[PDB]
RNA sequence: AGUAUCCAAUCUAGUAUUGGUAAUUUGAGUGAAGUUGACACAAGGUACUGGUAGGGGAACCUGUUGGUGGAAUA
RNA sequence: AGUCCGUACUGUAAAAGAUGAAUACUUCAUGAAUUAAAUAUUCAGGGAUAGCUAACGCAAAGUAUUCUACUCGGGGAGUAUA
RNA sequence: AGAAUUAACAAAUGAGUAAAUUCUAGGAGAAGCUCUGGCUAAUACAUGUGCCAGCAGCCGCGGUAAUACAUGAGGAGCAAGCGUUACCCACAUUGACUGGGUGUAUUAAAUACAUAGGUGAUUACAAAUACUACUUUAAAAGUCAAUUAAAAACCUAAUAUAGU
RNA sequence: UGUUUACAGCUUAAAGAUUAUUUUGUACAAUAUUAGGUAAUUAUUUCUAAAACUGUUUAAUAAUAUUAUUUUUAGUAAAAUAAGCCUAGAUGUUUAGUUGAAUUUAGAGAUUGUUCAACCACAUACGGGUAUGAAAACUACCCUAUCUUUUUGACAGCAGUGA
């Protein structure tokens, strides 16, 4: 047989993790693979964020080796230098322009901000500022007595 | 006892070994009874009797003696054949040796007094014994074994297990158990 | 064992004839009376049983009255009552051809009763809470 | 004492060959030799691991291995190797002696009108054999044969045995 | 193409081995306030009992060897 | 009859020290025996104790090491069947 | 309990769905089941019954004086479960490597030689191994002590094997 | 006899990846109320058949004059010689899918081998057999046999029905 990349599930029912794996094409691909490269969570947690993630060292042996990714993970490793996009449906010099993005969820992250002070926040953010400058031109005096 | 049994197992069937070659018995009686007659007891020679008169050496002579004095000529007469050192009394040449002798004398005993039940269970410690020293000198000097068993009739039959456990038994090789 | 062929083979079963199973139906051909041992003294009522599986039986009868003739469905549980012997199994209640035991308003659970329109208030919430 | 003795397996101990595992090589102890052309009967040894008890086990085997020169005897103490299977129950041939066993070669050294008789009793069985009993299994084909010689070659002997006595009986009557 | 060889299912018979069923017969455990007798635990009123042989309404009795899981005798 | 002898079978028991085989070390008394200026120790249960043990009890059934075997409640039962 | 909105799995196309957000009402709007002699937390309370009727997981209750049956009250506990049965594990040194016992507690077979196998004296020397630290292989899922006090997660350790 | 660097599609060879098949060691339940089992059986040599043929020189081999020799698979519907092989629970009977691992557990371990996953096996029948292909029989195809309805068919594919 020859080699294929492509995806393979972990997650469970309403919640999808998938995987990366070389594995030929006559297989389960539930089964067996030859070599686990990376990962795909869409999902976030207080632990967990959206990620995509491969190992370059094993991705540059089998494309050097005879193989040949899928659509989507030709998506993904366009991003690491070592393929292109795969082409949209339609195709590309013919997209027409539409409205600016926007962000609709913030994706629950709890940043260091302060509660039930909403009133004087931008009280805290001037005296946090100012504590920059003066370390600076105040750690010049150091560096003269060194 | 040793039997010919080449698994690990020792049944019913399988023979014992063989204590002589064919007509070894009756050699080795021909050849007492040429001793018999022209010997005289173990610590004294021909040369120191011959002052003294034929009443002296006739007593002396071993015709007259009893079987537990004729062998113990024949016990030193093979020491200073199959000896490593001067006073050599104890080593695996000798020891063979000896069992050979008795060997003529249980049989005798036990082929005419059958019922000595004790005797019957001796036979069978004495082969065993002479199997293991028997052994032991083929690991040891090879050259002596042969040189051993054409006197005294024997078989050269090598031990089924090969020497395997007393010569150079190591590192006994390696492999792993699972489910 | 060999009426035991799962397990630890050395254990001698606690119900041999149920055997493996938790329970089993059967049909009465005749009920009875046994008497108990000799420090107690009483009639305890029997009730016999053929099972699917073509093999005699006793068992025990634990409410006062009961339904029980010729020709009824019934249901082991595999316990037992102490002082009779071969009495080592009982039926369960509230199935085939038993009856809930009557004028009964305590330990509705062995018995098969069921549960009084007067005590209940509510209804489940799947329909008008 | 000696110097160069160091890495010679007999004062070493047979630690420092190095032997691959699995099976690949061995190590053992002859048990035949020249029973049967280029082959020797082998003993091994095994050790593994048995977490229950938390004590290594041992196990003995016996294999047979391929000699070329039909070289090995006994105490012969030798590695062997795995190799493809030439025939049944020879997966195995000898690499190296490690300790060696003394030979019986001083000794070997030191150690036919009948054709005619043996030719005949041949056909004899086989043109009786073939016409009652045909080949159907090879326990017959050999078991008559080696049992049926000696019952031949006492009588085949026999026929020899006149031969001396008619020819002197013609000298003992033509002379007088 | 086809002749001739090799081979399977099904069927026949008996044999070998293992299971199911039965006229009839027999054993054991268990329950209860039964009858007959009194074997056993004390020296159980003749010390018990093992192996064995014979005898025998039952429990048991006797010979022959062994043991104490029996007392007693100064 | 048998009991005794010869030839051969039979192969069981409370078959016993009811205590698997071997090695090393270990208490006090009482007592048995060599007989030692070649050579110096061995043994006993009819006593007790350390220690161990459920207790009675054991100088091993004690302290330490090596190998083998049996043991999964009782009746049924050392019986049925083959 | 009710109603509404959105993200993301397709920055063209969603079957279906946030362990997400906001709003209003109103203010626990979800409770049963077992037990009441001892093991076992809870009554020497009341009535009738009289080795009968019946309870009973084990011991065992009931014979006119029943905290054990049945009636009633009171009281205890577990809790979207409570209780019963059947099988398995632990508690158990109840199957003995860790970790037993074998004189008398239904356990050393009548006994010895002996094979396979197991096991084992001194010093000196080599070699290798163990132990320590690092490293190889042993699919993922699952388990696993993941750590900067963090859930919807991806502990790399143990054990075994080769090797420095 | 338009162009095969215009696009698609196909053929042939090599290099390498992966895959299929072939090989070994150890592990792998009870039972002796089962102990002999195996018979082209165990080993070597030979013969036959298929693998492209011939020569030149060189190397190496045994003797040594220098000529000759140099490989792999299969078959007992090829033969000969010698007699061995397994029995260190062979064979035989019974039971059972193995494993990762699940329940439990301080830990070792014990009992089970459901869900998912890997490998093996079956697809009405412990059945016989073929074509294609890199690899097959699972809804392939042929035959026999069992059962059943249409000469089809076998729901251990999902859902569903009966028992
Ligand atoms: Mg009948
Ligand atoms: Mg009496
Ligand atoms: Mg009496
Ligand atoms: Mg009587
Ligand atoms: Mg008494
Ligand atoms: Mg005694
Ligand atoms: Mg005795
Ligand atoms: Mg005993
Ligand atoms: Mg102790
Ligand atoms: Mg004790
Ligand atoms: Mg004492
Ligand atoms: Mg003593
Ligand atoms: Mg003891
Ligand atoms: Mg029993
Ligand atoms: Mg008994
Ligand atoms: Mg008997
Ligand atoms: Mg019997
Ligand atoms: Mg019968
Ligand atoms: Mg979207
Ligand atoms: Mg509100
Ligand atoms: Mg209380
Ligand atoms: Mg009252
Ligand atoms: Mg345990
Ligand atoms: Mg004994
Ligand atoms: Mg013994
Ligand atoms: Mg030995
Ligand atoms: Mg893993
Ligand atoms: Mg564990
Ligand atoms: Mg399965
Ligand atoms: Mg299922
Ligand atoms: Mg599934
Ligand atoms: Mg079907
Ligand atoms: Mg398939
Ligand atoms: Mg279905």
Same mark, same amino acid.
């Given at each position: 047989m020859?080699?294929?990349i ?6 469970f ?6 995987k990366?794996?070389?594995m ?60 292109? $996009? ?9 997209l ?42 105040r ?8 | ?8 197992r ?17 050699? /080795? ?55 490593? #050192? ?7 040449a ?15 005993? @036990? ?6 039940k ?30 051993? @068993? ?17 010569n ?11 489910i | ?7 630890? /083979? ?20 005749k ?9 107690? #003294? ?5 009730? $016999?049983?053929?099972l ?13 009255g ?24 009982? @039926? ?29 208030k ?8 | ?20 595992? #699995? ?8 048990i ?7 082959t ?12 229950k008890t ?7 085997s ?9 070289? @090995? ?27 060696p ?16 008789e ?16 045909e ?17 031949? /070659? ?7 045995? $006149? ?14």
């Amino acid at each position: 047989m020859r080699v294929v990349i492509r995806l393979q599930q972990s997650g469970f029912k309403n919640h999808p993790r998938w995987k990366i794996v070389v594995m030929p094409q006559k297989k389960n691909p539930r089964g067996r693979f030859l070599e686990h490269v990376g990962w795909w969570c869409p999902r976030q947690g207080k632990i967990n964020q959206r990620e995509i993630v491969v190992n370059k060292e094993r991705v540059r042996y089998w494309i050097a080796m005879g193989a040949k990714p899928s659509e989507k993970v030709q998506k993904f490793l366009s991003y690491f230098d070592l393929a292109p $996009k795969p082409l949209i449906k339609y195709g590309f010099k013919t997209l027409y322009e539409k409205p600016e993005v926007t962000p609709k969820d913030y994706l629950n992250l709890s940043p260091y901000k302060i509660k039930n002070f909403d009133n004087h926040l931008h009280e805290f953010i001037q005296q946090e500022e100012e504590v920059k400058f003066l370390k600076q031109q105040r750690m010049k005096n150091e560096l003269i007595k060194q | 006892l040793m039997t010919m049994s080449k698994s690990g197992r020792q049944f019913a069937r399988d023979k014992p070994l063989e204590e002589f070659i064919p007509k070894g018995l009756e050699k /080795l009686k021909q050849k007492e009874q040429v001793t018999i007659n022209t010997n005289y007891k173990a610590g004294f020679t021909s040369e120191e009797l011959e002052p003294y008169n034929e009443m002296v050496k006739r007593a002396l002579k071993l015709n007259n003696a009893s079987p537990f004095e004729i062998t113990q000529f024949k016990v030193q007469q093979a020491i200073q054949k199959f000896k490593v #050192s001067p006073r050599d009394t104890g080593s695996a040449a000798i020891q063979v040796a000896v069992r050979t002798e008795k060997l003529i004398k249980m049989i005798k005993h @036990c082929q005419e007094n059958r019922q000595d039940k004790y005797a019957g269970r001796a036979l069978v410690r004495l082969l065993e014994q002479r199997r293991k020293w028997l052994d032991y000198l083929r690991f040891t000097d090879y050259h002596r074994y042969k040189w051993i @068993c054409e006197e005294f009739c024997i078989p050269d039959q090598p031990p089924l297990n090969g020497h395997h456990k007393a010569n150079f038994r190591g590192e006994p090789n390696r492999q792993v158990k699972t489910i | 064992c060999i009426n035991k062929k799962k397990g630890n /083979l050395h254990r001698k079963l606690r119900a041999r004839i149920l055997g493996i199973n938790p329970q089993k139906k059967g049909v009465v051909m005749k009920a009875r009376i046994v008497t108990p041992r000799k420090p107690n #003294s009483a009639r305890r009522p029997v009730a $016999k049983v053929i099972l699917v599986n073509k093999k005699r039986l006793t068992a025990h009868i634990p409410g006062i009255g009961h339904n029980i003739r010729r020709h009824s469905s019934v249901l082991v549980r595999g316990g037992g009552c102490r002082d009779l012997p071969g009495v080592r199994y009982t @039926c369960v209640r509230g199935v085939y051809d038993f009856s809930k035991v009557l004028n009964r308003f305590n330990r509705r659970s062995r018995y098969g009763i069921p549960k009084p329109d007067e005590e209940k208030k509510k209804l489940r919430r799947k329909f008008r809470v | 004492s000696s110097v160069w003795n160091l890495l010679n397996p007999i004062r070493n101990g047979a630690t420092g060959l190095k032997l691959l595992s #699995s099976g690949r090589e061995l190590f053992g102890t002859v048990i035949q030799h020249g029973k049967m052309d280029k082959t020797v009967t082998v003993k091994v040894d095994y050790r593994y691991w048995y977490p229950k008890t938390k004590e290594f086990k041992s196990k003995t085997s016996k294999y047979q291995v391929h000699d070329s020169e039909n070289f @090995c005897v006994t105490g012969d103490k030798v590695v062997i190797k795995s190799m493809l299977p030439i025939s049944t129950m020879k997966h195995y041939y000898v690499r190296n002696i490690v300790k060696p066993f003394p030979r019986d070669t001083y000794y070997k050294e030191g150690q036919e009108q009948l054709k005619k008789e043996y030719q005949r009793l041949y056909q004899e069985f086989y043109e009786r054999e073939q016409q009652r009993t045909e080949i159907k299994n090879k326990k017959d084909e050999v078991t008559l044969k080696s049992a049926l010689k000696a019952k031949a /070659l006492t009588r085949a002997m026999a026929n020899l045995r $006149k031969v001396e006595s008619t020819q002197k009986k013609k000298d003992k009557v033509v002379a007088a």
